[PDB]
Amino acid sequence: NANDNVVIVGTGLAGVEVAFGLRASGWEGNIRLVGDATVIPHHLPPLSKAYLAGKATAESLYLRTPDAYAAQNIQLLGGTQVTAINRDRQQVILSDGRALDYDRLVLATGGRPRPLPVASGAVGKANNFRYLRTLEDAECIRRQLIADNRLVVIGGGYIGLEVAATAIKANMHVTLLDTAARVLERVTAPPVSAFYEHLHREAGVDIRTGTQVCGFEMSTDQQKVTAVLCEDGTRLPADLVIAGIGLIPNCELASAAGLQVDNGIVINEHMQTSDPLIMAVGDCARFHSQLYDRWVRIESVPNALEQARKIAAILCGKVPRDEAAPWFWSDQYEIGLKMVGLSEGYDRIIVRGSLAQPDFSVFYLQGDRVLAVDTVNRPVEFNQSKQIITDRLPVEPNLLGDESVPLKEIIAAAKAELSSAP
Ligand SMILES: Cc1cc2nc3c(=O)[nH]c(=O)nc-3n(C[C@H](O)[C@H](O)[C@H](O)COP(=O)(O)OP(=O)(O)OC[C@H]3O[C@@H](n4cnc5c(N)ncnc54)[C@H](O)[C@@H]3O)c2cc1C
Numbered sequence: 001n002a003n004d005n006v007v008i009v010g011t012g013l014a015g016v017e018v019a020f021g022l023r024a025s026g027w028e029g030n031i032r033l034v035g036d037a038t039v040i041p042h043h044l045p046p047l048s049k050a051y052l053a054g055k056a057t058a059e060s061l062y063l064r065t066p067d068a069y070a071a072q073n074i075q076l077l078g079g080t081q082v083t084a085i086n087r088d089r090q091q092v093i094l095s096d097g098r099a100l101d102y103d104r105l106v107l108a109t110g111g112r113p114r115p116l117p118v119a120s121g122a123v124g125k126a127n128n129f130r131y132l133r134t135l136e137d138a139e140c141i142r143r144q145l146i147a148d149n150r151l152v153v154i155g156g157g158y159i160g161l162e163v164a165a166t167a168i169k170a171n172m173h174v175t176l177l178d179t180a181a182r183v184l185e186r187v188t189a190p191p192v193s194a195f196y197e198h199l200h201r202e203a204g205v206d207i208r209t210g211t212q213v214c215g216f217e218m219s220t221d222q223q224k225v226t227a228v229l230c231e232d233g234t235r236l237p238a239d240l241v242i243a244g245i246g247l248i249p250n251c252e253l254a255s256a257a258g259l260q261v262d263n264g265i266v267i268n269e270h271m272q273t274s275d276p277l278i279m280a281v282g283d284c285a286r287f288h289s290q291l292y293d294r295w296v297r298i299e300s301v302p303n304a305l306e307q308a309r310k311i312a313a314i315l316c317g318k319v320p321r322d323e324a325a326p327w328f329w330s331d332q333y334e335i336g337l338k339m340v341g342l343s344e345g346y347d348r349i350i351v352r353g354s355l356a357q358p359d360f361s362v363f364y365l366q367g368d369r370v371l372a373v374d375t376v377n378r379p380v381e382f383n384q385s386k387q388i389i390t391d392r393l394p395v396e397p398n399l400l401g402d403e404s405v406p407l408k409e410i411i412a413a414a415k416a417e418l419s420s421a422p
Contacts, residue, residue: 002028004103006315007092009082009253011035013044014282014304015108016063021312023072031074032100034092036081039135040066045301047138048162049331053169054142061135085257087275103277104315107265108308109250110283111299116154116243118215128224129216129241132159144240147171152228152236154213155244156183158330161196163242164205165332175206175236177228182209189349192362192374196332199358203333208234216241247299249284262286264297271311279315281307290323291390292342292371300328325389338382341372341389350401352381361385363400370395381407394418 006022008015011033019031035041042061050056069076084093085105092100113131115124123129128144130137141163145151151167153160156178164176180186182193197207208230217227217235228236249264259274260266264286271279271287282304286297303326310320327340335358346364353360361375361382369392373385384407388395393414399405 001103004029005032005101006030006104006106007032007034007100007102008106008108009034009092010108010110010250010282010284011037011041011076011078012108012110012282012304013041013063013301014110014284014308015106016041017305017308018106018108018281018311019074020064020068020072021309022315023074025312025316025318027312027316029103033069033074033076034080034082034094034100035076035078037134038079041076042135044133045331047135048132048159048166052138052142052145052163052166054145058135082253085253085278087257087278090277105275105278106311107254107273107278107280107284108282109253109265109280111247111249113244114246114248116213116245118213119243122218122223123216123225126218126224126241127222128239129243131243132163133247141240141242145170145172146239148173149239150237151175151240151242152177152238153242153244154228155242155246156180156207156209157244157246158184160242160244161200161332162330163244164200165203168200168204169333172240174204175208176200177211177213177230177236178207178209179212180209183207187343188374189343189346189362189364191349191351191355195355195376199333199335247283249286249297251284254278254280262295266295270314271307279311281311289326289342291325291392292344296326296342298326298328300326302327325386327386336377336379337374338379339372339374340382340385341370343372343374346371350397352401352403352407353378365397368394368397370400384408384411387411388414 008018019033041063081095082092083095090102113133130141150173153164153176164174167174183196184193212231214231215229216225219226225241228238251261251265254265255261265280265284266286267280273280283299289296313320325340330337343364345366347366350363358376361378363370364372375382395410395414399410
């Protein structure tokens with residue numbers, strides 16, 4: 001609006017993508033990015049992959065080159081923590097006491113690592129006990145990915161698995177602990193969890209499921225972890241401990257500002273929070289999925305880009321793209337893993353291919369409806385799966401597992417059934 005000033009809280013992929021999106025959709029007003037992080041906004045996925053492997057330059061991580069902020073006239077204010085929002089005056093209050101005025105406010109606060117209770121005090125503070133979320137976290141762990149050293153990963157989520165895969169490649173003695181009965185218990189089917197556990201075990205990782213960490217042993221001098229103790233009494237000697245038991249959405253700001261909060265900042269079809277002038281986006285945002293007809297909060301890059309762009313369109317009086325099936329990816333041992341949709345509430349699963357090799361797709365179904373698909377080294381079936389989920393195609397369930405029948409044809413028939421037959 002040439003006059004309307006927009007303020008974005010959070011310099012993560014979400015906030016940065018909103019900033020450049022805005023200026024790309026023809027926003028002439030001023031754009032301010034305020035983030036507590038001091039570093040240059042960078043990519044996160046590399047931190048448990050190539051960067052964690054020391055095979056990518058720090059420079060390749062930048063979301064956008066520093067010149068780009070200048071060129072696009074985007075003001076970046078780092079190392080600054082926003083402590084409050086005054087919806088009334090329409091201001092943002094910094095930790096130094098300063099205040100910024102806004103006509104439009106975007107909350108791209110992401111989330112923070114969920115603290116491991118038995119790791120409070122000295123444990124957490126140790127140089128060899130880290131969580132993985134910041135550039136600093138990554139480099140600190142990378143400096144310690146040492147051959148023959150012993151690593152204990154506490155947490156069996158995708159990042160946990162990606163870390164274990166990188167540490168293994170680095171020839172460390174790796175042990176991964178999960179309280180769940182099987183890795184990725186909540187988001188995949190048993191046979192899928194079996195694939196990962198065998199993949200990693202085969203690779204050398206010792207996975208201990210249904211295992212709980214009661215505490216740690218430490219050295220009095222260095223104040224470093226020396227071992228991980230399990231509830232069952234097992235002692236795991238450790239040189240490095242990487243904890244990851246989930247993410248906590250940063251909602252405090254909206255919470256104290258009277259905005260609706262529920263395991264994330266609540267937004268409507270227009271990305272608006274309880275307050276019309278305030279929008280939320282990214283890992284922090286809880287929105288309604290019309291595709292699944294329920295409130296969700298996605299923590300993924302594609303989710304950030306989709307939401308970010310939508311916000312830019314709206315604020316620029318443009319029309320937002322139609323909701324797209326959610327998806328994300330994971331890279332482990334060079335295996336291309338891509339997942340689309342949300343598997344919650346599935347009745348059965350159908351495996352298209354053999355689970356005895358990284359080359360198959362797993363369709364998650366609730367009745368005859370396909371909820372999600374996890375593909376392993378199948379980029380084309382993944383793209384085709386996107387279509388099915390998004391457009392709710394009536395693909396024939398009994399043909400999904402049959403590999404003699406191309407997925408393209410199964411889809412073609414489903415679309416044909418939609419046209420000529422009621
Ligand atoms: C190691 C790792 C690997 C990943 N790999 C993948 C992957 O392979 N594929 C995929 O799809 N996704 C992956 N993700 C997730 C993906 O990176 C994120 O979902 C995406 O980048 C969106 O992040 P965000 O910007 O919403 O939140 P964040 O990246 O957390 O950004 C929010 C920023 O706002 C700051 N902030 C919060 N409150 C305030 C405040 N009051 N004042 C100032 N600043 C504040 C936060 O400190 C933070 O810097 C990975 C994440 C990690 C950590």
